[PDB]
Amino acid sequence: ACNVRCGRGWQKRSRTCTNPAPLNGGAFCEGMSVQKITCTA
Amino acid sequence: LQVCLPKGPTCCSRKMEEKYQLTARLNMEQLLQSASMELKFLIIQNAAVFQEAFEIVVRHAKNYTNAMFKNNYPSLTPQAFEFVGEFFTDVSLYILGSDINVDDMVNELFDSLFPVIYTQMMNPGLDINECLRGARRDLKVFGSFPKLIMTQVSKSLQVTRIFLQALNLGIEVINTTDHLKFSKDCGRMLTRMWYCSYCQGLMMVKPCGGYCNVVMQGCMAGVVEIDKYWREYILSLEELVNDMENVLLGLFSTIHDSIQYVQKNGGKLTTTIGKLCTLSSRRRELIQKLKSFINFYSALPGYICSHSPVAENDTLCWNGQELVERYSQEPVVSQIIDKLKHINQLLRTMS
Ligand SMILES: *[C@@H]1O[C@H](CO)[C@@H](O)[C@H](O)[C@H]1NC(C)=O
Numbered sequence A: 001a002c003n004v005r006c007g008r009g010w011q012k013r014s015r016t017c018t019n020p021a022p023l024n025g026g027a028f029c030e031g032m033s034v035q036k037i038t039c040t041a
Numbered sequence B: 001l002q003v004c005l006p007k008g009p010t011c012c013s014r015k016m017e018e019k020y021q022l023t024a025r026l027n028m029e030q031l032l033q034s035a036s037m038e039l040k041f042l043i044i045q046n047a048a049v050f051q052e053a054f055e056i057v058v059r060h061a062k063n064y065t066n067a068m069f070k071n072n073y074p075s076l077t078p079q080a081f082e083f084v085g086e087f088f089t090d091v092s093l094y095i096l097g098s099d100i101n102v103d104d105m106v107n108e109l110f111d112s113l114f115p116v117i118y119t120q121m122m123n124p125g126l127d128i129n130e131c132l133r134g135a136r137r138d139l140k141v142f143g144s145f146p147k148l149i150m151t152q153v154s155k156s157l158q159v160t161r162i163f164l165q166a167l168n169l170g171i172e173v174i175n176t177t178d179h180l181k182f183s184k185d186c187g188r189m190l191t192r193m194w195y196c197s198y199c200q201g202l203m204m205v206k207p208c209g210g211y212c213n214v215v216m217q218g219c220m221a222g223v224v225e226i227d228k229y230w231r232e233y234i235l236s237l238e239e240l241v242n243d244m245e246n247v248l249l250g251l252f253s254t255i256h257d258s259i260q261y262v263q264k265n266g267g268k269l270t271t272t273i274g275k276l277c278t279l280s281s282r283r284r285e286l287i288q289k290l291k292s293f294i295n296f297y298s299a300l301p302g303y304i305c306s307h308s309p310v311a312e313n314d315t316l317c318w319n320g321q322e323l324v325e326r327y328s329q330e331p332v333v334s335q336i337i338d339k340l341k342h343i344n345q346l347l348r349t350m351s
């Protein structure tokens, strides 16, 4: 939900590295983990 | 038909039986997801928060080191910014599981730091750079400071790395639970328990509590075996929480004192070289909330039966094949147990 009631707000989308999670020194997930977009309420 | 035991006639064909089987699959997956959702969201929240918090700590520590270099040693900038950025980049890379050598981070830091100290602070006035880099370690100009920082940061960074990997693997196994595919025999037994009553023309009849118990203890014989390893996982994580913010934030003071130490012997050093050349609160709340789910795998069949429509009284109920007055009476799980054993060994060793 947009944190700000009126004007510029925020919307987040999480992307975890768990399917599968790296083990025994596996290469970590490549790219970004969070997604943020500006919203107008 | 291959599922619905035909005692009399039947109101459903083989295709309707397949539809009932797929709806049984979907209902089981939905029930498992509803059972696992609270714990999944708890661990996802905490994993995200700890990851962002560690990145914030590393960025702030790099910022403070850069600021103290800007203020106290302007002659070492802008080269100081490059090696500080490389050092803390390698720090973050180690935290996130990449193959980084901590001793090599510190050694490359001091190897890059010494030549600019010599050229700008000690002997004011590019090719001789490597001779200075060699003299750094050959003459032990920084004393015991490099090994002190090495142990100070390796000890915290390893526990943080393994904490993050443990959180992520817990997320992984909890996501696997509600996606656990079952045997075909269990598919047919669940179809009989939930839907095969409709094939016999019954509208609102529910299966017996005891029949649900035998079916669930039938297909969760493997899943319940995970409970020992999940309990050991919880307790080993509790062992680990009982660290990295303090160290990375005092790094700047330690480096400044090392620079003072090297400047202290400048007389002999210049001539010799000229000749030669709220976090703890979060992990506590996380462990106290995680200990409420230590019975997760042992209470799971009880959840499936107590949240599925069942006749608890075992009276006028469906027994999988007929309406009775009273009831008579691995591979993916192996992967879950493998990863739990691995992470549990890794946890216990940091203790
Ligand atoms: C570090 O802190 C100071 C505080 O005044 C700020 O001005 C500067 O932009 C910061 N630098 C970084 C790299 O965060």
Ligand SMILES: *[C@@H]1O[C@H](CO)[C@@H](O)[C@H](O)[C@H]1NC(C)=O
Pocket: A019, B033, B040, B175, B178
């Ligand atoms: C589990 O990971 C899979 C990967 O596609 C994803 O589809 C699912 O939404 C995740 N689990 C939960 C229960 O949110």
